[PDB]
Ligand binder design. Structure first.
Ligand SMILES: *[C@@H]1O[C@H](CO)[C@@H](O)[C@H](O)[C@H]1NC(C)=O
Ligand SMILES: O=C1O[C@H]([C@@H](O)CO)C(O)=C1O
Ligand SMILES: [Cu+2]
Length: 198
């Protein structure tokens, strides 16, 4: 149970910590009433700028693995096409063995980053954070935020809301993580070589 803090998600005041519905019904972005209201301040990401990726919550579930992905859709739906710009395998959204202290609203001390790469054209996008928790029930977490990019990619990995089911206890390694892959966890938790993520 975690949520993205930066970049600021759409409709943050109605955005909760819960994972996506196991049946896929609220993929993408936790579909719900008025799900796609932009925050007041525009999140501007210059190409090549190191941008913050930060979280709120203490129920870190031993970490896991995350992606950062972009779509041109400003009201994403099941038909939205996503472009992965970063994969974090292990240690996301925290490199601890279980949960942390603080409440549902605590700023997560473990912080991350992403950079818009050279192949993304300037324009408005939705950015998604997705997270596959290491410990606990097999879930997929997802929050979405508008960003404006100012002056060839894998499709998003989707699991646990379909037939692809991940293995409990491991930091998964995405089949097609892209050219920007970061390992932020303990090597002993990385999914063993030769096992598929599903
Ligand atoms: C982004 O975060 C990763 C993981 O902590 C770190 O290795 C890297 O140095 C960070 N980038 C910058 C520019 O600080
Ligand atoms: O509505 C918008 O207009 C500009 C657009 O030019 C961005 O590509 C901007 O920053 C918005 O949020
Ligand atoms: Cu949880």
């Amino acid at each position: 149970h975690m949520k993205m803090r930066q970049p600021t998600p759409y409709s943050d005041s109605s955005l909760n910590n819960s994972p996506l519905a196991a049946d896929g019904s609220d993929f993408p972005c936790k579909l719900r009433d008025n799900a796609f209201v932009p925050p007041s301040q525009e999140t501007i990401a210059q190409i090549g700028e190191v941008m913050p990726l930060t979280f709120t919550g203490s129920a870190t579930h031993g970490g896991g693995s995350c992606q950062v992905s972009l779509t041109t859709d400003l009201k994403p739906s099941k038909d939205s096409k996503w472009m992965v710009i970063k994969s974090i395998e292990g240690g996301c959204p925290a490199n601890v063995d279980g949960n942390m202290s603080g409440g549902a609203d605590v700023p997560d001390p473990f912080e991350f980053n992403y950079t818009i790469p050279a192949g993304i054209e300037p324009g408005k996008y939705t950015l998604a954070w997705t997270w596959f928790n290491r410990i606990g029930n097999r879930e997929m977490y997802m929050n979405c935020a508008p960003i404006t990019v100012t002056a060839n990619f894998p499709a998003m990995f989707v699991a646990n809301i379909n037939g692809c089911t991940t293995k409990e206890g491991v930091d998964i390694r995405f089949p097609d993580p892209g050219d920007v892959v970061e390992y932020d966890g303990n090597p002993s938790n990385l999914q063993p070589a030769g096992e598929a993520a599903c």
